[PDB]
Design an enzyme around this catalytic site. Structure first.
Site, PDB file in Angstrom:
ATOM      1  N   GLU A  76       0.909  -1.323   0.083  1.00 39.79           N
ATOM      2  CA  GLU A  76       0.147  -0.036   0.045  1.00 39.79           C
ATOM      3  C   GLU A  76       0.741   1.418   0.168  1.00 39.79           C
ATOM      4  O   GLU A  76       0.509   2.107  -0.655  1.00 39.79           O
ATOM      5  CB  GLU A  76      -0.830  -0.111   1.190  1.00 39.79           C
ATOM      6  CG  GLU A  76      -2.225  -0.848   1.026  1.00 39.79           C
ATOM      7  CD  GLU A  76      -3.072  -0.530  -0.058  1.00 39.79           C
ATOM      8  OE1 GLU A  76      -3.218   0.671  -0.235  1.00 39.79           O
ATOM      9  OE2 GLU A  76      -3.441  -1.551  -0.884  1.00 39.79           O
ATOM     10  N   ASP A 112      -7.599  12.491  -7.069  1.00 41.25           N
ATOM     11  CA  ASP A 112      -8.596  11.223  -7.271  1.00 41.25           C
ATOM     12  C   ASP A 112     -10.002  11.897  -7.655  1.00 41.25           C
ATOM     13  O   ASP A 112     -10.749  10.906  -8.062  1.00 41.25           O
ATOM     14  CB  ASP A 112      -8.695  10.552  -5.790  1.00 41.25           C
ATOM     15  CG  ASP A 112      -7.899   9.371  -5.681  1.00 41.25           C
ATOM     16  OD1 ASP A 112      -6.830   9.369  -6.469  1.00 41.25           O
ATOM     17  OD2 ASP A 112      -8.373   8.424  -4.973  1.00 41.25           O
TER      18      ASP A 112
END
EC number: 3.2.1.132
Length: 259
Positions: A37, A55
């Site tokens: 991650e 995003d």
């Protein structure tokens, strides 16, 4: 001090009562999850992780990818995280708005999204400072549990599996690919992993099924997905299901290059 200091006293009681795993086990699980991650085994630094990844999901915060919301994420888990923090601080009517006020953040809930007026520098600067706040860490884990862990643990229990590797692997799958919904989520993968009552055999089949879809966009950039799954499968092959006294094994299985 041990891995115990990476959580909080109350948080450990919570994880232990609801998952059956201790501080060492959860610490090892987080090392395995944080490698693919963030490419960083020092996961505690991410309690205060805060960044706008452009995003269209607002700001990404914390350990499990919660966002504050935007056009591409209208059901963010960020509001739930802040509400849990307000509750941990003792509020009788906990809310996301209450949490932002405590923190002195200029923002508020608009629908199911958090509208933050402060700049990223100011907003994330305040989040970074929460890294060693016991109530924030508790809120972080309580939310992680409601979003991904509870479901993972229930799926393991339903099959009579309770090992640290099984729970951690399920959690990594839920966090990365989603808990329920499509055929690529934890729910979907389990539906096609068979029905073996042998935990090792089941997990081997589950991992094989996951390897088929893990490198699909947007889950991971190949072969990072293949590598993240291989971490768990290698622990199964070595019979280190309990994830205790495995510091050396953890250094070895995470010894791979990202991208």
């Amino acid at each position: 001090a041990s891995p115990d200091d990476n959580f909080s006293p109350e948080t450990l009681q919570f994880l232990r009562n609801n998952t059956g795993l201790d501080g060492e086990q959860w610490n090892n699980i987080m090392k395995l999850i944080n490698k693919p991650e963030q490419d960083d085994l020092n996961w505690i630094k991410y309690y205060g992780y805060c960044e706008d990844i452009e995003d269209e999901r607002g700001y990404t915060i914390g350990l499990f990818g919660a966002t504050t919301g935007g056009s591409r994420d209208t059901h963010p888990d960020g509001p739930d995280l802040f509400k849990a923090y307000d509750a941990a601080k003792g509020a009788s009517n906990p809310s996301a708005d209450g949490a932002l006020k405590r923190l002195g953040i200029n923002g508020k809930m608009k629908g199911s999204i958090l509208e933050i007026k402060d700049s990223e520098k100011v907003f994330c600067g305040k989040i970074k400072k929460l890294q060693n706040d016991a109530a924030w860490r508790k809120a972080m884990w309580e939310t992680f549990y409601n979003v991904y862990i509870r479901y993972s643990v229930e799926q393991a229990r339903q099959r009579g599996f309770t090992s640290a590797v099984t729970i951690g692997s399920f959690v990594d799958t839920a966090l990365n690919q989603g808990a329920t919904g499509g055929s690529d989520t934890l729910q979907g993968l389990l539906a096609r992993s068979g029905s073996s009552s042998n935990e090792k055999t089941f997990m081997k089949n589950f991992h094989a099924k996951r390897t088929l879809v893990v490198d699909t966009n947007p889950y991971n950039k190949p072969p990072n997905g293949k590598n993240r799954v291989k971490q768990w499968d290698t622990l199964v092959d070595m019979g280190k299901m309990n994830l205790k006294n495995v510091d050396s094994e953890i250094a070895q299985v995470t010894d791979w290059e990202m991208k």
